Amino acid sequence: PFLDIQKKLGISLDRHFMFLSAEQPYKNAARCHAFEKEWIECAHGIGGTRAKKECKIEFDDFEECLLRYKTMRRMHDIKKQREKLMKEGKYTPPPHHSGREEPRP
Amino acid sequence: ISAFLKNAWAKEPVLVVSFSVWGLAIIMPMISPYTKYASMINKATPYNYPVPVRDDGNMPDVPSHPQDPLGPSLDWLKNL
Amino acid sequence: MNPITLAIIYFTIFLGPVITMSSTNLMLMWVGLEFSLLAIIPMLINKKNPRSTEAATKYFVTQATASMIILLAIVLNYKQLGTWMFQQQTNGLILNMTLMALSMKLGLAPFHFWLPEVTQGIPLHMGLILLTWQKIAPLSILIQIYPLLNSTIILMLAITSIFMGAWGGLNQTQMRKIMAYSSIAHMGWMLAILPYNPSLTLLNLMIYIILTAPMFMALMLNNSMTINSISLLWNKTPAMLTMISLMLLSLGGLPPLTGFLPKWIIITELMKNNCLIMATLMAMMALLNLFFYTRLIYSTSLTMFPTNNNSKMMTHQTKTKPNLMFSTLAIMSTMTLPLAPQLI
Amino acid sequence: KRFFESYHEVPDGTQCHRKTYITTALGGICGIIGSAYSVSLNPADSTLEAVARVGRYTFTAAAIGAMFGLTTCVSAQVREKPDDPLNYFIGGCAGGLTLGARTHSYGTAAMGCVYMGTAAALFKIGKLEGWELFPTPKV
Amino acid sequence: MMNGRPGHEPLKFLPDEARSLPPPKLNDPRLVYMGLLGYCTGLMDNMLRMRPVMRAGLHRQLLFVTSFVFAGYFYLKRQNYLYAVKDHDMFGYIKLHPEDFPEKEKKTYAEILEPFHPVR
Amino acid sequence: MNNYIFVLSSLFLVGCLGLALKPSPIYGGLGLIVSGFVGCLMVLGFGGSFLGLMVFLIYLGGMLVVFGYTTAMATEEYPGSNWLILGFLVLGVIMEVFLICVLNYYDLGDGLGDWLMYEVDDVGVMLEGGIGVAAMYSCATWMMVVAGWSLFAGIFIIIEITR
Amino acid sequence: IVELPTLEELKVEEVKVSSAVLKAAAHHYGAQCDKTNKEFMLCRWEEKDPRRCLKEGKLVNGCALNFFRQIKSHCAEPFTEYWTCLDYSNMQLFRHCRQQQAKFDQCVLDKLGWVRPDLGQLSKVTKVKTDRPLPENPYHSRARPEPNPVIEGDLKPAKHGTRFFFWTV
Amino acid sequence: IMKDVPNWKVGESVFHTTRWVPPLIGEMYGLRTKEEMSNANFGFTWYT
Amino acid sequence: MPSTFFNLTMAFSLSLLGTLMFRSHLMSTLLCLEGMVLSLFIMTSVTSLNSNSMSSMPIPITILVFAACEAAVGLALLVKVSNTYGTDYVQNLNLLQ
Amino acid sequence: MNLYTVIFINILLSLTLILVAFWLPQYSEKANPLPFSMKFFLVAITFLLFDLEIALLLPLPWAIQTIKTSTMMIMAFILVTILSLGLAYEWTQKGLEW
Ligand SMILES: CCCCCCCCCCCCCCCCCC(=O)OC[C@H](COP(=O)(O)OCCN)OC(=O)CCCCCCCCCCCCCCCCC
Numbered sequence A: 001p002f003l004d005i006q007k008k009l010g011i012s013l014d015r016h017f018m019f020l021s022a023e024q025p026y027k028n029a030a031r032c033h034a035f036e037k038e039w040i041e042c043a044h045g046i047g048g049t050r051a052k053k054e055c056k057i058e059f060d061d062f063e064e065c066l067l068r069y070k071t072m073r074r075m076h077d078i079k080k081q082r083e084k085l086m087k088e089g090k091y092t093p094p095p096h097h098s099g100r101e102e103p104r105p
Numbered sequence B: 001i002s003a004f005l006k007n008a009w010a011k012e013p014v015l016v017v018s019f020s021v022w023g024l025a026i027i028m029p030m031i032s033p034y035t036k037y038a039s040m041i042n043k044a045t046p047y048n049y050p051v052p053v054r055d056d057g058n059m060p061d062v063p064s065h066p067q068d069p070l071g072p073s074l075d076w077l078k079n080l
Numbered sequence C: 001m002n003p004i005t006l007a008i009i010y011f012t013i014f015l016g017p018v019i020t021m022s023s024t025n026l027m028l029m030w031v032g033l034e035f036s037l038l039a040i041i042p043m044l045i046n047k048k049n050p051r052s053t054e055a056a057t058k059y060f061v062t063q064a065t066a067s068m069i070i071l072l073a074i075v076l077n078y079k080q081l082g083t084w085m086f087q088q089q090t091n092g093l094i095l096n097m098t099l100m101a102l103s104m105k106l107g108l109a110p111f112h113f114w115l116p117e118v119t120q121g122i123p124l125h126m127g128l129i130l131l132t133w134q135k136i137a138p139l140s141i142l143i144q145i146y147p148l149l150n151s152t153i154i155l156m157l158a159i160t161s162i163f164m165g166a167w168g169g170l171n172q173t174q175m176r177k178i179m180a181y182s183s184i185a186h187m188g189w190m191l192a193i194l195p196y197n198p199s200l201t202l203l204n205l206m207i208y209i210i211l212t213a214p215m216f217m218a219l220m221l222n223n224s225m226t227i228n229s230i231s232l233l234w235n236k237t238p239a240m241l242t243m244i245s246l247m248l249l250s251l252g253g254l255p256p257l258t259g260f261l262p263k264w265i266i267i268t269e270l271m272k273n274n275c276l277i278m279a280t281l282m283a284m285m286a287l288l289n290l291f292f293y294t295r296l297i298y299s300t301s302l303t304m305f306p307t308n309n310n311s312k313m314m315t316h317q318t319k320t321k322p323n324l325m326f327s328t329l330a331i332m333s334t335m336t337l338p339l340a341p342q343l344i
Numbered sequence D: 001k002r003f004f005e006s007y008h009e010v011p012d013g014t015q016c017h018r019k020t021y022i023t024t025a026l027g028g029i030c031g032i033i034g035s036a037y038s039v040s041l042n043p044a045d046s047t048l049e050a051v052a053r054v055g056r057y058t059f060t061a062a063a064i065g066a067m068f069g070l071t072t073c074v075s076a077q078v079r080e081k082p083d084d085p086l087n088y089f090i091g092g093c094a095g096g097l098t099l100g101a102r103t104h105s106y107g108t109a110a111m112g113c114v115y116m117g118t119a120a121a122l123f124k125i126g127k128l129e130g131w132e133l134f135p136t137p138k139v
Numbered sequence E: 001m002m003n004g005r006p007g008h009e010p011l012k013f014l015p016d017e018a019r020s021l022p023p024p025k026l027n028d029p030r031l032v033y034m035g036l037l038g039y040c041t042g043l044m045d046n047m048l049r050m051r052p053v054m055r056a057g058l059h060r061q062l063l064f065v066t067s068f069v070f071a072g073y074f075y076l077k078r079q080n081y082l083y084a085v086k087d088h089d090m091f092g093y094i095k096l097h098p099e100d101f102p103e104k105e106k107k108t109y110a111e112i113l114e115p116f117h118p119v120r
Numbered sequence F: 001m002n003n004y005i006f007v008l009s010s011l012f013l014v015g016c017l018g019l020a021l022k023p024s025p026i027y028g029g030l031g032l033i034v035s036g037f038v039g040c041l042m043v044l045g046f047g048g049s050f051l052g053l054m055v056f057l058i059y060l061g062g063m064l065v066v067f068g069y070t071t072a073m074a075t076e077e078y079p080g081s082n083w084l085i086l087g088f089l090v091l092g093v094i095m096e097v098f099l100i101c102v103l104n105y106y107d108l109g110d111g112l113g114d115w116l117m118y119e120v121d122d123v124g125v126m127l128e129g130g131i132g133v134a135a136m137y138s139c140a141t142w143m144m145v146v147a148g149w150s151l152f153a154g155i156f157i158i159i160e161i162t163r
Numbered sequence G: 001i002v003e004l005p006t007l008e009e010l011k012v013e014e015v016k017v018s019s020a021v022l023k024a025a026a027h028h029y030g031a032q033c034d035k036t037n038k039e040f041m042l043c044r045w046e047e048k049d050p051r052r053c054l055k056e057g058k059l060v061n062g063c064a065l066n067f068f069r070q071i072k073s074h075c076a077e078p079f080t081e082y083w084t085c086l087d088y089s090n091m092q093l094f095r096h097c098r099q100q101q102a103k104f105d106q107c108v109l110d111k112l113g114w115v116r117p118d119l120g121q122l123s124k125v126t127k128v129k130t131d132r133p134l135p136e137n138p139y140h141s142r143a144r145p146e147p148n149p150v151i152e153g154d155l156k157p158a159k160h161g162t163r164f165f166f167w168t169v
Numbered sequence H: 001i002m003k004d005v006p007n008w009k010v011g012e013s014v015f016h017t018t019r020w021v022p023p024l025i026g027e028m029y030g031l032r033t034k035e036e037m038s039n040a041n042f043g044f045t046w047y048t
Numbered sequence I: 001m002p003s004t005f006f007n008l009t010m011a012f013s014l015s016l017l018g019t020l021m022f023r024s025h026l027m028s029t030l031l032c033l034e035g036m037v038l039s040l041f042i043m044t045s046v047t048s049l050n051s052n053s054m055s056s057m058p059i060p061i062t063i064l065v066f067a068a069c070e071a072a073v074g075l076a077l078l079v080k081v082s083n084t085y086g087t088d089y090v091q092n093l094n095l096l097q
Numbered sequence J: 001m002n003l004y005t006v007i008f009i010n011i012l013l014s015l016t017l018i019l020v021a022f023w024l025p026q027y028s029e030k031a032n033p034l035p036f037s038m039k040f041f042l043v044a045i046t047f048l049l050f051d052l053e054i055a056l057l058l059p060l061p062w063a064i065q066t067i068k069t070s071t072m073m074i075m076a077f078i079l080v081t082i083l084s085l086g087l088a089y090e091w092t093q094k095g096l097e098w
Helices: A005-009 A033-040 A054-065 A069-087 B004-010 B021-027 B035-044 C003-022 C026-044 C050-080 C092-105 C114-121 C124-132 C136-148 C151-171 C175-192 C198-221 C227-231 C239-251 C260-272 C278-302 C311-316 C324-334 C337-343 D002-009 D016-040 D047-079 D085-102 D106-129 E029-048 E058-096 F005-020 F025-045 F049-073 F082-106 F133-137 F141-162 G019-024 G026-031 G035-046 G054-073 G077-086 G099-110 H025-029 H034-041 I002-019 I026-050 I058-084 J002-023 J038-055 J069-093
Strands: none
Touching: A005 C003, A033 A054, A054 A069, A069 H025, B021 J069, B035 J069, C003 C026, C003 C136, C003 F141, C026 C050, C026 C124, C026 C136, C026 F141, C026 I058, C050 C092, C050 C114, C050 I002, C050 I026, C050 I058, C092 C136, C092 C151, C114 C124, C114 C175, C124 C175, C124 C198, C136 C198, C151 C175, C151 C278, C175 C198, C175 C227, C175 C260, C175 C278, C198 C239, C198 C260, C198 C324, C227 C278, C239 C278, C239 C324, C239 E029, C260 C278, C260 C337, C324 E029, C337 E029, C337 E058, D002 D016, D016 D047, D047 D085, D047 D106, D085 D106, E029 E058, F005 F025, F005 F082, F005 I002, F005 I026, F025 F049, F025 I026, F049 F133, F049 I026, F049 I058, F049 J038, F133 F141, F133 I058, F133 J069, F141 I058, F141 J038, F141 J069, G019 G026, G019 G077, G026 G054, G035 G054, G077 G099, H025 H034, I002 I026, I026 I058, I058 J038, J038 J069
16 A cells, blocks of 8 residues: 555555455355456456456446345346236236245255 | 562462463463364364365375275374 | 653554555554544643643544544445455445545545644644644545545645635734644645645655644744744744745745745646646645745744843743754755755 | 536527526525535524525525626627627626625625636636646546 | 556665666765755754854764765665656557557658748 | 334434434433444344344443443533424434435335345354454454554553543 | 256255254265265365256265165164154254164164264365366356556666756756 | 246346356245245244 | 445434534534444444455454544543533633634 | 244333333322542443453454464453553552542
């Protein structure tokens, strides 16, 4: 950073734990460990100004591994559809909703 | 100095103990035959699953089977 | 102060900025800011005069809420990017918060009200630390994040500060507050070039430190918090009248002295980046700052104000000397201009 | 915001109505902000007194906004020359005069006229010459 | 700016690469200035402390003229490097990205026709 | 329910609105002690037994209690009827509903679905907060040292201020 | 459509025996049915996808049922008395059903030739040879961008010197 | 069922990697009985 | 969470409006100030918990430890004020004008 | 849940018992019934700077089982000690003294 007394001294008191893909205790990988990796091994050697346009696929994905919002919109839409159809009985609670269907190990 | 501890053991007989056990606990680990095992008995516990490595034939030690004579055998933790 | 306490505090006031600068995990940057807040408050109330408690209670509330806002920015980032640190992707509002917050701790522009008042109730000494070793920390955080901050806001806070600082200074007669106001102004120039060339911020700061540190140790040599008080400098200690004159004109941008370089290269960098609108208005009111600097010049040097008879008594007694730092920081400051190319 | 910008889109001197409306709003907005700072600091004595001050500042500012807009647009209309700093100066000239009146001072009108008009003229030039304000770092 | 450059020494003063550059001549006007800048600091000190201005602290005067100068050679040695890096960096880019910095042909005045505004 | 968290979140805002109307120094302390209870509960909802209880143990009874304590010693002069504040507070109680309402019709929404415990190992152990907080002693031993100095130099800062 | 195996495919005979009996016959289930279970893991951790190793999964669900099937014919009654006490606890400790353990181990030491492992002989990482081709580009990582080019050469005193304002330097 | 109106592609993974997104609790049981969502989302916290 | 994370954030803004709009007693402010630290602590803990990011749980607590002392300093200033004026009203803190 | 039920039942019992208390019964001036304890405040923030101490000492139960056991020991001892030295300073400061 402003004064890199850490790299110089070789110590790493503040770097080992800055991202979700850092070593998690007992090797319990966090959500998205896959993406963030893919989005920081990409932006390594390429500065930010160019980690912001071409390495946009990996952030657009990592922005949806963690926010997980585009999913919501899908699911929420699906939800509404069911509702309308169901009200007119167009759609019926699936066998799953009816339960059973052989819940298995 | 040695006879100053004698009133501090007669009167004030608390802080003596608190600075005699504060420390005792700093020297017991550095001088005990069994302090090595605490980072080892705590290192043996397989909390998560041991992922097996693919065989190449270039690995003699890696014990092929759970019951091979090879590998981390703890006849130590037993009767530690 | 039990010398032990003095050490713990001073260490914290010094570990405070240093952790901020060294760390990259923003969190660790926040606690560096937090320590500085905790360490400075004890020293501020050393006299424990009724004015002092007011000073600290203001400084603390202003510092504390800003600290909480900076933490909120870090907490929000943590959810927009798992990282604990600002990145290209950071939501713009996330960064703007950090600018406002950090511009409160540094006291720039529309948040410039606390500084003049705390500079008025603290001793001259703790005044220096509160003005110059407490600006290093927040600025570090900004300079690190410069690529990402907004050019518009900074400029507005920059211009505002320049104006507020200048206008405020014109009326003030208390020295501590004249300096507080100058610092607001210089702090403004510094934050103007941050988005464009951070390296110049670090020059417009050092020069400010090499200018203000001699200026304050001058104010306290005779411990004068009044211009009337500094005006009788000619009787109390005549030699410092010459350099006090040049350092104050150096603090303003007049060309032969070292003080021109920061303004000159900041203007050169802003014109290189095309802000010939902004740069022009800043330079113009920058000229207002020199007016109040020269008004003080008038009272202290160019004209000799009348003195009390007891001043002869203080002359008799040997005057405790000014530390060496005064000289080395007065000359390196009043005249290094011939060596500008290597400074930048 | 697509609104304020509209002021610039249509050629100057044309559609004065829109111009005056937009200019009046900006002044008024500034009025509110200005009154706010004026009330937050240097507070009033009674809520009503302060509501009044907000009104006073808002209207005065709205007025300077209107006359600026109206004068500049019309000056251009009557003069038929759309692109001319002078149009704006006359406008700024007028705007200052309104401020002067609201403050009941001929002198203020003096400084107001010159300073305000000059500023507005520079805005016109700025737009004509494509001057960039608050520019992004392009080094 | 120049930070983030490949190979950057994270906390070093002047990387050995700066050995390649010529050393600053000890009498470089600048170092000589720093000397005078220093002597003056010394003289000033004597003055503020009310001592015979020139005839006092003749040991200090030396510490000053010799501290400032010492500092200079090792600073200038660096600032010189920094500037030298700037060219290495600048010139290189001009080439690696040649098209963006294309050589231009300037028509002899014979060809170009700048208009003539008469003073009259 | 599924809106296990929302409801609570709403209660947390209510308590913060109470602290924001700046009610009498100790009547609002209660307010904090209420939303601290509420925030203690939410974290528990997500499985942070330790982190959660921690709040109920330190901020709740340690920090807050000491706060009111001092209120009693000073700044509990208990000289606007809080009832007026409760009146306003009630306004906000539903005024916030208004803020939510716009986005309510706009609608995530319909209470709270699977917007909690996103991913949990359906098998496995050692997955539990307090294993993470105990990284103060392995792989995150710098946060531990700096916290020490805070509290440690805290002693010296407080006494010096008090003296 | 994201590939999602047909439910029909997923159909496999299943263990369907409560956790208690699994916990009883586990240490023998680590001795036997290990080559068939580790290769699943060795696919599972290499090939990070449950839509590809389902092959070896059906094998695991197979060798296990094999394990018990022998125990059901061979030495079933003493096995029933073992987990029938072990499931009485609230955490199914071996610490209590320790007499039922040897009575089942000697019944299984004689018949079927099995010997229960020693203490630490299921925590070692065995090396399992398999044929599954190495899953390259796991994570389907789109090609990375190239590093910025490297200006090259040696430093030469700067050109014409600091090019500052009239500082001929 | 539930999807015969326009502009819908069944199984439209929202990511681009095509790697195995470990399904989220929500997507796994959500559209299923109100009981399942809790039993997955609150079964352990509620005890034993 | 996305929904809730909003409530906590507005809680912090409602606590923000509180500390930036004083009224009489200071102890109210300091109290409000603390309302933010709770909201920050809750939000930091919440996201860390649903990101399964255990490496970061240290922070939720470091935030509290620093915030507690911060408040300790704040209250000592407060006690200092109602020892010099004895009424702790932000109203009398105006000597510095 | 169960915990909810219990804690809630525990409340209802408490409330009822005060409900009955103010209603079963069914003027006379019957109702008719200070300086700062600086010492107290001190004691209070002494407790704040120590309660937080515990909060940083509660991880021990789960850190004892860390691989770097040697590290935990070291890290802990310092905390307990630096906090004892603080208390000790208070002692000398006589802050502890009432
Ligand atoms: C680029 C040019 C910039 C401008 C240069 C010229 C202006 C220099 C700055 C002057 C600023 C102060 C003006 C008013 C000074 C008043 C001094 C005074 O009142 O006299 C007392 C003072 C101290 O007295 P003391 O030395 O103790 O003994 C006498 C006791 N009555 O007596 C003294 O202070 C004596 C020492 C005074 C300082 C001597 C400075 C001589 C002039 C320096 C010129 C430098 C020119 C450089 C040109 C560069 C060209 C590139």
